[PDB]
Design a protein around this ligand. Structure first.
Ligand SMILES: NC(=O)C1=CN([C@@H]2O[C@H](COP(=O)(O)OP(=O)(O)OC[C@H]3O[C@@H](n4cnc5c(N)ncnc54)[C@H](OP(=O)(O)O)[C@@H]3O)[C@@H](O)[C@H]2O)C=CC1
Ligand SMILES: CCc1sc2nc(N)[nH]c(=O)c2c1Sc1ccc(C(=O)N[C@@H](CCC(=O)O)C(=O)O)cc1
Length: 186
């Protein structure tokens, strides 16, 4: 299995959600960025795995579930089986990551992408080892009811360049945003 990664889009007040959806109106090229980063694998014959909480699963419009070309794993302790359209169910982040080492997945999975929500971001960010965060900074405040956990910059270095990630300011629907990549190893 390849690298472990989080990906998120976050407002200036660290909002990631409101009422089961995003705080901001749809940013189509920001969604396309999410799709390109989470789907693209450099390793032939492999796919990437997405790990998400249950509310995050049900926040994706049904027509886009499962996230296509990716293996979709949902975290829940109440569900008894994967939701309709999902591929896997785990009861903890540690279980999910261990599952990637089972024979069922060991040679199928390239990258692992944690796509939220707040509790799994927080646990992953504090998971010892090598991790990258792909953070879209939405450069306005948006009313939110779900927030990104604190990024500890003593351990997460903001990278000064990354192949394939645009460095300049983006703007859609009058909303400016920029892409960042962080990396820790501890
Ligand atoms: N801007 C962005 O990049 C993102 C935005 N969002 C937004 O955030 C909101 C959803 O996030 P959030 O509210 O944090 O919810 P989550 O997606 O984290 O879902 C929470 C539920 O998932 C299960 N769960 C979460 N973590 C674990 C775990 N480690 N092990 C087992 N079960 C787990 C639980 O289900 P159970 O009770 O069944 O055990 C829990 O009640 C939505 O508004 C969505 O649109 C989400 C991701 C990214
Ligand atoms: C899954 C939770 C995440 S992680 C993330 N990261 C960044 N940078 N931006 C985001 O908005 C999200 C979100 S919220 C989100 C992301 C993607 C989608 C979605 O439907 N994605 C489709 C593409 C949707 C489209 O093409 O309009 C896909 O990846 O196949 C829905 C909600």
């Amino acid at each position: 299995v390849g690298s472990l990664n989080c990906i998120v889009a976050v407002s200036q007040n660290m909002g990631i959600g409101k009422n089961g959806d995003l705080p901001w109106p749809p940013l189509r090229n920001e969604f396309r960025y999410f799709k390109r980063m989470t789907t693209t694998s450099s390793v032939e014959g492999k796919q990437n795995l997405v790990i998400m909480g249950k509310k995050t699963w049900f926040s994706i419009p049904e027509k886009f579930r499962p996230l296509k070309g990716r293996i979709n794993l949902v975290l829940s302790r109440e569900l008894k089986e994967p939701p309709q359209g999902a591929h896997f169910l785990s009861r903890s982040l540690d279980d999910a990551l261990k599952l990637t080492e089972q024979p069922e997945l060991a040679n199928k999975v390239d990258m692992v992408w944690i796509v939220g929500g707040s509790s799994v971001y927080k646990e992953a960010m504090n998971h010892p080892g090598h991790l990258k965060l792909f953070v879209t900074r939405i450069m306005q405040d948006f009313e939110s009811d779900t927030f990104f956990p604190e990024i500890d910059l003593e351990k997460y270095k903001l990278l000064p360049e990354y192949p394939g990630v645009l460095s300049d300011v983006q703007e859609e629907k009058g909303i400016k945003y920029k892409f960042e990549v962080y990396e820790k190893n501890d």
